[PDB]
C-alpha cells in the first residue's frame, strides 16, 4: 500500500501467506 | 474532556507513538537512554547529559547506551519515566499529558507489581485523564480485521503466542518465552569474536544489530548449509572497514528454533506455536491451524515462513490445512490495532479514569488487565 510505504520497516517482494499443499 | 487518546506501543527495541485515528505511527525511536562517557572541555559543546531518539543516533559514539526495559520488564523506572516525558516533549508528540487519555500495550504474563508501578506514573507523576492497558495479541486482530486466529508475536524482548477464537481468548493456552531478537544479537556477537572482531562498547553492539538486520538468512535445512561452502558477504563499518560474516549468517538465527545452542532449557519457537494450539479443545484445533497470524520484528528473517511451516507441519497432526498469514506491516500491526481500538466509542467504558483510580486504586487495573 502507498500509505504504509512511507515507513522504513515495510516488507517488500515477499509472499503474504504461507500454506501447505492441498494434494497429498 | 474527550480529547483524542494517545497510543504508546512500549516495545523493547523501538517505541511507536501517535494519536488515535492516525494510519501509521508518526514518532518511532529506539528504547534506550544515551549519556556522554567522554569529558566536556569546550564552552560551545553539546548541552545535556540525556540524549533520546535521533539526537542519540546522530551522536552515538559520544554516548553510553543502557536499555531500561529487559524481556518487557522495566528494570530502571527513573529512565522509563524520562522516555514517556520525551513522548510528550516538543521533539515527539508535543501535547499535555493532562488533556489526552493513553492506551498502553504490555506483554502477557508480566508481574502484578510491574503494572501497579507503571500505572502509578500515569496517574500520580502524570495527571492523565484515563489509562487503558491492552494485550498485544488482541490489538493485532483489530489491525488484521479477524476475530479468529493465533497471534505469534516474536518481538526483540519477548516471544509469546495467544490463541483467540471468534473474540474469545483462552488464558491457559498462552505460552511466553524470554528468548527474543536481542538474544540472537548477543549470540551473533559470540561468532564475530570467534572470527576475531571485538565489539565491547554499547555503541558497537548497535552496529552488530544492524549487521544482523542487513545480512542474516534462516536456513531451510541446517545440515545442507553446514556442509555447503557459505558465501562471505562483506559489511562496511562507519569508518570504512569490511567484515566477512560467512557461516555465522545462518548459525545466529537458528537460536529461535533451538534454545539449547545458547544453553537455555526451554522449548523452540516452533514448539511454542503448535503446543499453544494442542492445549486448546479438539473442536478449535483444526481452525487455529487454518488461522495463524505472524507478528513481531523477529519474523523478518529471510525464509522465516518456509522454515516455520516445515517445523509446524512435522509437529501438527497429519492431513490438516496449515495457513500462516503474515501482514506486510508486521512491525506496525500492534500499534495500528491500538489506533483502531482507541477510535471506538466503546473505548470510553473500557479505560480507567483518574478519579476512578484514586478511589479504588491498582485493583481496577488488575480486574480489567485481561
Amino acid at each position: 500500500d502507498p500509505k504504509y510505504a512511507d515507513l522504513p520497516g515495510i516488507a517488500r517482494n515477499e509472499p503474504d501467506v504461507y500454506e501447505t499443499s492441498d494434494l497429498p | 474532556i474527550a480529547n483524542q487518546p494517545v497510543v504508546i506501543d512500549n516495545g523493547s527495541g523501538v517505541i511507536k507513538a501517535g494519536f488515535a485515528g492516525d494510519q501509521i505511527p508518526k514518532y518511532c525511536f529506539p528504547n534506550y537512554v544515551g549519556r556522554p562517557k567522554h569529558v566536556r572541555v569546550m564552552a560551545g559543546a553539546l548541552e545535556g547529559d540525556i540524549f533520546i531518539g535521533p539526537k542519540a543516533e546522530e551522536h552515538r559514539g559520544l554516548l553510553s547506551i543502557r536499555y531500561p526495559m529487559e524481556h518487557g520488564i522495566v528494570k530502571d523506572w527513573n529512565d522509563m519515566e524520562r522516555i514517556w516525558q520525551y513522548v510528550y516533549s516538543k521533539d515527539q508528540l508535543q501535547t499535555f499529558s493532562e488533556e489526552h487519555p493513553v492506551l498502553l500495550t504490555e506483554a502477557p504474563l508480566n508481574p502484578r507489581k510491574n503494572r501497579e508501578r507503571a500505572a502509578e506514573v500515569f496517574f500520580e507523576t502524570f495527571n492523565v485523564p484515563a489509562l487503558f492497558i491492552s494485550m498485544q495479541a488482541v490489538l493485532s486482530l483489530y489491525a488484521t480485521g479477524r476475530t479468529t486466529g493465533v497471534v505469534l508475536d516474536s518481538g526483540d524482548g519477548v516471544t509469546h503466542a495467544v490463541p483467540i477464537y471468534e473474540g474469545f481468548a483462552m488464558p491457559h493456552s498462552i505460552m511466553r518465552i524470554d528468548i527474543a531478537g536481542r538474544d540472537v544479537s548477543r549470540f551473533l556477537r559470540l561468532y564475530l569474536r570467534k572470527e576475531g572482531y571485538d565489539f565491547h562498547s554499547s555503541s558497537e553492539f548497535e552496529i552488530v544489530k544492524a549487521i544482523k538486520e542487513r545480512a542474516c538468512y534462516l536456513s531451510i535445512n541446517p545440515q545442507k548449509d553446514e556442509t555447503l561452502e557459505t558465501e562471505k558477504a562483506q559489511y562496511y563499518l562507519p569508518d570504512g572497514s569490511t567484515i566477512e560474516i560467512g557461516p555465522s549468517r545462518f548459525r545466529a538465527p537458528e537460536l529461535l528454533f533451538r534454545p539449547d545452542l545458547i544453553g537455555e532449557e526451554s522449548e523452540g519457537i516452533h514448539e511454542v506455536l503448535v503446543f499453544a494450539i494442542q492445549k486448546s479443545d479438539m473442536d478449535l484445533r483444526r481452525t487455529l491451524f487454518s488461522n495463524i497470524v505472524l507478528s513481531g520484528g523477529s519474523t523478518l528473517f529471510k525464509g522465516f515462513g518456509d522454515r516455520l511451516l516445515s517445523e509446524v507441519k512435522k509437529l501438527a497432526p497429519k492431513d490438516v490445512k496449515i495457513r500462516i498469514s503474515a501482514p506486510q506491516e508486521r512491525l506496525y500491526s500492534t500499534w495500528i490495532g491500538g489506533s483502531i481500538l482507541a477510535s471506538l466509542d466503546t473505548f470510553k467504558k473500557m479505560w480507567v479514569s483518574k478519579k476512578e483510580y484514586e478511589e479504588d486504586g491498582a485493583r481496577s487495573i488488575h480486574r480489567k488487565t485481561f
Binding site: - | Q223, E226, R251, R258
Partner: protein, 34 residues
C-alpha cells in the same frame, strides 16, 4: 601425587566433535572412561 590420582582415569573419544556443527542435536565430548 597428582599423576597417581589421575593415573587410571580414561575418556571415551569415540564420536568426538567439539565444533560448531548444528546437525544432529547436542553433543558432549569424552563419553566415559570405560
Amino acid at each position: 601425587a597428582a599423576y597417581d590420582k589421575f593415573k587410571d582415569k580414561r575418556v571415551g573419544t569415540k564420536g568426538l566433535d567439539f565444533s560448531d556443527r548444528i546437525g544432529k542435536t547436542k553433543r558432549t565430548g569424552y563419553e566415559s572412561g570405560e
